UniProtKB/Swiss-Prot annotation:
One BP annotation, GO: proteolysis
Domain Peptidase A1 residue range list: 17-328
Record-annotated disulphide pairs: 255-290
Catalytic class of the enzyme: hydrolase
Name of the protein this chain belongs to: Endothiapepsin
Amino acid sequence: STGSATTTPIDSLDDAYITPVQIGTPAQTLNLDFDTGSSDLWVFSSETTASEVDGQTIYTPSKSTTAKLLSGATWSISYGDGSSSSGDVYTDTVSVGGLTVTGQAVESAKKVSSSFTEDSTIDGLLGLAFSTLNTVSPTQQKTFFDNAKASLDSPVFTADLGYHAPGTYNFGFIDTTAYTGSITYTAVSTKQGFWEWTSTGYAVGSGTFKSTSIDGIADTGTTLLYLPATVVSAYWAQVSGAKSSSSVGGYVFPCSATLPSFTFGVGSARIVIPGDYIDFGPISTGSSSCFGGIQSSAGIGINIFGDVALKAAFVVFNGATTPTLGFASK
């Protein structure tokens, strides 16, 4: 089997991407944030505290003839950005772009943190990291990809995120028309439950390439590119007027400035992030100060190849017995 779904930016800045997901019988369609940095499929639901729902589409298990309470099961997650949610668990039929999993754990939110409430466009998350990170207790549950894997034509999914435009998640096949040149594959460590890999280095604009190992995760659920402070400093030093602002919480720059590209290495291959991808607009309405899309990972404890990086590539998440990651230009 295969599946193929369009993923759509939630706003004009590509702050996140939502993908429609069918849950239950008859189908309830929710727009979920596909997140290769976590491993829970959780949704706004009829069980969510009423005051914490503000425009989201909810899953109502009682209206699904295939929903079954996973008795005794609870879940609770906190994300790197300080947000969180928790609740109980159902199993139900879940379909993505034609690909159907029966008995998928659907984690129903009783509580969500304010950032989730305040974002009307995201109805939940669909985690695509390794199932070892799944928070369901007492019995850890598998991700949608893990459940589908054996049935897929090939045990892979791909992320093709657009810049200020829709893109595609495919399951079970590699669309050879979706990228240029070849796909370069690189090793993955699953020891922290992430799609964790080591970039071979970077360049800033037309600058020479710096060969240096950068361990990080391929994370569709994180908006920006978070790299070591040395790397980030070298980037913004090439932007006139750029500065790190403690009050804003990162590098900002005047919108009149031209942003250089940023290149990262995948083995001997090179992925070029155009400068425009690194502009996240005014810090506040009407401000001439713009927020940067490359920021320091210092104090996160890990480097994160988020959407800013991934949307410059066609990315293969290869779930073979030994997982690997593939990157192509496009």
